């Protein structure tokens, strides 16, 4: 499987401290079932997004259904099935910091995955139950698709 | 509708003294997003006051209050309805437009809102005020029945519904409500087929509701140990044929996909049930059935982490907090530390509302035995828990003694009560053995604290 996370989101605010760059913007999105925050940064130029749109974000460790844990390299000439065939916007990054509300005695209840896709950041803040599949220094994908609803 | 929408999208920007354009613009957006029609009514209410001092006709205010009725502005919609009734009364000379009908529909919506406003007395009064002046009306006479039906399905509900059918047998709503009456008591399992084929005549065809009611009443016959007799397989095939037929004529119907997912799950394809239920969930997951059907697949694949939440979401609705079926589906193969003691808490929460059920008072005993054997067999654990385990086991044994005397069961006799009794006997033996271990650990901690106090005295 390799599905490290799966949930529907919806966008509520776009660059709230004002748009800094010209091709990237902040997406302060929210969940619908797990009730988790999202600070995804998409390329607004090639993939425009407006407020109120919903999308199916799926953090996956690999793009293959069988989960063969690809080494990591660009190989366009590949006839194997890929999960990206049903997604309009796929990215590749490496989570680098997992912050949480830990204390000295009792374990954390809310974590915060910080992943950097070569420059585009995302904070998947929320409970510490569905973030068990995130470990520091590990490659992950994005695999989002906007919902027509 | 598209050419109309383009035409209003042209009339909107320019201002050739528009008066009724916003009325038309709202008249089409009632099916679409409910907000746009509200905005059109908001601007149209004020556009009717500049030409002359003419009070707003009650039809526009009635429609805007109806729009707000579906929303959370129940009080504001009530004010709209009251003002609409008061204007509609003022039309003493609009006999051609039938101000009386406008008052009737406004009061109908108002009574519906009062029924929705936790005030059934006023809604009964208003619906009766409609009845006393126009007995040939169906909807009011049908809503009074549901009002009576909350208190019970044998009160004036079951009489008023049949009387409304007797005055109009060609009304699909009333006949479907006649069908709904038999759903409270499923003793009419095979017999409800006849009353559901009354209006299956070609004149009423096609009717997806009667067909899906047949499909549901045919699915209810499943979950029986007589499948090997080539009886339930035929039932699955018949229900699947019904679902295929309602799928060909209507590909967008979600209940057909729900039914085929249900039967495919019954066929042993739980891996292939997720894909079929996926479209139903993505279309509209806010239906009570899909949450439970998907949580069944999740709890079947040893995923209680993804199943307990989906059971709690179905309970988030404003209908109840402690349902028996949801908690029954909650505890399926729970064995972990956080899925046994807390399972006892939710079982107690369930049994609190209705302790008369035998399944709850069997399951609590079973989980008590599970924790008792999880602390009195391989442990060698804390001492206070050994002292509590014997009390829990004694309560479980008392429930074992009490359960054997009950006549009726969950369609399966509990004559298998011997095995847990033998289990409890051997756990009593093991607990009497392990209390000595508890005392040994007590002595061990006493000597360690002594040999630490001596070192502190040295310092």
């Amino acid at each position: 499987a390799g599905i490290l996370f799966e949930d529907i989101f919806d966008v509520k605010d776009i660059d709230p401290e004002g748009k800094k760059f010209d091709r990237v913007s902040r997406l302060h999105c929210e969940s619908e079932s797990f009730k988790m925050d999202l600070i995804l940064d998409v390329n607004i130029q090639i993939y425009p997004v407006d407020l109120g749109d919903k999308f199916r974000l799926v953090i996956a460790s690999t793009l293959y259904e069988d989960g063969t844990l690809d080494d990591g390299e660009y190989n366009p000439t590949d006839d194997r099935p890929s999960r990206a065939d049903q997604f309009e916007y796929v990215m590749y990054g490496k989570v680098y910091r997992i912050e949480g509300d830990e204390t000295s005695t009792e374990a954390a209840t809310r974590l915060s995955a910080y992943v950097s896709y070569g420059g585009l950041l995302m904070r998947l803040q929320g409970d510490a139950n569905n973030l068990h599949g995130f470990e520091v220094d590990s490659r992950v994908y994005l695999l989002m698709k906007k919902l027509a609803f | 509708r598209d050419i109309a929408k383009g035409h209003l999208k042209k009339v909107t920007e320019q201002y050739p003294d528009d008066v009724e354009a916003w009325i038309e613009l709202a008249q089409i957006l009632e099916q679409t997003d409910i907000q746009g029609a509200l905005s059109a009514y908001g601007t149209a209410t004020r556009i009717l006051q500049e030409k002359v001092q003419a009070d707003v006709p009650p039809e526009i205010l009635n429609n805007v209050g109806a729009l707000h009725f579906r929303l959370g502005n129940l009080g504001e919609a009530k004010k709209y309805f009251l003002a609409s009734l008061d204007r509609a009364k003022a039309e003493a000379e609009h006999d051609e437009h039938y101000y009386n009908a406008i008052s009737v529909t406004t009061s109908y919506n108002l009574a519906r809102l009062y029924e929705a406003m936790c005030e059934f007395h006023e809604a009964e009064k208003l619906y009766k005020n409609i009845l006393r002046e126009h007995p040939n009306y169906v909807d009011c006479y049908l809503r009074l029945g549901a009002m009576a039906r909350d208190k019970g399905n044998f009160y004036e509900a079951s009489d008023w519904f049949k009387e409304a059918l007797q005055i109009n047998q060609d009304h699909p709503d009333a006949w479907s409500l006649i069908g709904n009456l038999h759903l409270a008591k499923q003793e009419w399992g095979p017999g409800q087929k006849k009353f559901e084929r009354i209006l299956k005549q070609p004149s009423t065809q096609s009717d997806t509701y009667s067909m899906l009611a047949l499909g549901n009443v045919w699915l209810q016959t499943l979950h029986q140990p007589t499948r090997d007799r080539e009886k339930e397989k035929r039932h699955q095939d018949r229900a699947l044929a019904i679902y295929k037929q309602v799928l060909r004529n209507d590909a967008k119907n979600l209940y057909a996909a729900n039914g085929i997912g249900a039967v495919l799950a019954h066929k042993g394809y739980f891996r292939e049930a997720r894909d079929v239920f996926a479209q139903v969930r993505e279309a509209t997951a806010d239906i009570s059935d899909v949450w439970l059907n998907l949580a069944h697949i999740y709890v079947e694949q040893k995923q209680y982490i993804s199943a307990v939440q989906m059971y709690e979401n179905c309970l988030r609705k404003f209908y109840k907090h402690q349902n028996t079926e949801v908690v029954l589906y909650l505890a399926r193969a729970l064995f972990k530390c956080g899925k046994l003691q807390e399972c006892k808490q939710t079982l107690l929460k369930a049994r609190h509302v209705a302790p008369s059920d035998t399944v709850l008072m069997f399951n609590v005993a079973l989980v008590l035995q599970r924790l008792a054997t999880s602390v009195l067999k391989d442990e060698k654990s804390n001492l206070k828990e050994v002292l509590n385990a014997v009390k829990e086991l004694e309560l479980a044994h008392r429930y074992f003694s009490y359960l054997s005397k009950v006549g009726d069961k969950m369609r399966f006799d509990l004559a298998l009560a011997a095995t847990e009794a033998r289990q409890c006997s051997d756990l009593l033996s093991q607990a009497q053995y392990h209390v000595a271990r508890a005392r040994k650990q007590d002595e061990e901690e006493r000597e360690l604290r002594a040999k630490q106090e001596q070192e502190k005295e040295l310092l």
Partner: protein, 300 residues
């Protein structure tokens, strides 16, 4: 009309009942609550503040009912463990433990004379145990499905019972006999209480209707539309001017006993309220629920 005190995280588990005194026998100033976390916390409502006085434990299962004796400063607590344990608010100690086994143990009913304790039975009877005896003195022979609610009249003249199918059983504690059987409901009756004058009888069923019947001639005095949920707890104001209603929808409406009108509603509970009770004067209205927060509602 508002909220005076707000006790956050009053319990670890959900609270199912609340008991508060009405007389001057060291009961109106102490709040006794019973929750599913097996802690009978004796809160002392002193200095206008809800302070914990005693923490009584011992119940195997969660507390199902708590009530304070009318003419006595002691209390008692029952559960589904079939071990009804009596307590004392003067010392925070246990008086006894009535083993109403195997399972036959339900909500309590303190007699106004503080001498008998009614307890529902799964067989459908209402067992009347003795406070100072603990043995089954006499049982009411009115079978059926089950007793879901039992209440004693403030002056001790009548006694009603809520069944699982809306069957009110008007008993006579003066002689121990069934007088009337009011069947104006078809839903399970959750809780009920007697009017301070023992003239009106409110029934809290699962239909959202507060049907207030009469006891003297066993007739309905009027159908009041309650909540949209199921009315869980209901109490009368000690001065007999209004009555609160606890339902299953995070809402506390104070309905008027005379005009059948909601005079005020509270929505400060994030979860459903399970228990509501008045003060000795009727200004403070204590409330509990699954929110595990005790709210003190002041209605001067």
């Amino acid at each position: 009309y508002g909220i005076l005190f707000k006790q956050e995280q009053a319990h670890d588990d959900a609270i199912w009942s609340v008991a508060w005194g009405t007389n001057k026998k060291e009961n109106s100033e102490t709040v006794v609550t019973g929750s599913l976390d097996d802690l009978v916390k004796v809160w002392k409502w002193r200095d206008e503040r809800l302070d914990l006085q005693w923490s009584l434990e011992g119940h195997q299962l969660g507390v199902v009912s708590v009530d304070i004796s009318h003419t006595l400063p002691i209390a008692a607590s029952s559960s589904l463990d079939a071990h009804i344990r009596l307590w004392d608010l003067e010392n925070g100690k246990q008086i006894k433990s009535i083993d109403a086994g195997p399972v036959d143990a339900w909500t309590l009913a303190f007699s106004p004379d503080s001498q008998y304790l009614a307890t529902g039975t799964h067989v459908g009877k209402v067992n009347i145990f003795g406070v100072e005896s603990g043995k089954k003195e006499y049982s009411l022979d009115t079978r059926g499905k089950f007793i879901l609610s039992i209440a004693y009249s403030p002056d001790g003249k009548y006694l009603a019972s809520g069944a699982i199918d809306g069957i009110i059983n008007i008993f006579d504690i003066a002689t121990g006999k069934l007088l009337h059987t009011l069947e104006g409901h078809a839903m399970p009756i959750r809780s009920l209480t007697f009017s301070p004058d023992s003239q009106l009888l409110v029934t809290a069923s699962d239909d959202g209707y507060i049907k207030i019947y009469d006891v003297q001639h066993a007739n309905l005095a009027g159908t009041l539309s309650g909540h949209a949920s199921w009315v869980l707890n209901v109490a009368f104001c000690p001065d007999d001017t209004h009555f609160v209603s606890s339902s299953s929808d995070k809402s506390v409406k104070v309905w008027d006993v005379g005009t059948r009108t909601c005079v005020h509603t509270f929505f400060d509970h994030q979860d459903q309220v399970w228990g509501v009770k008045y003060n000795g004067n009727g200004s403070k209205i204590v409330s509990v629920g699954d929110d595990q927060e005790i709210h003190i509602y002041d209605c001067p």
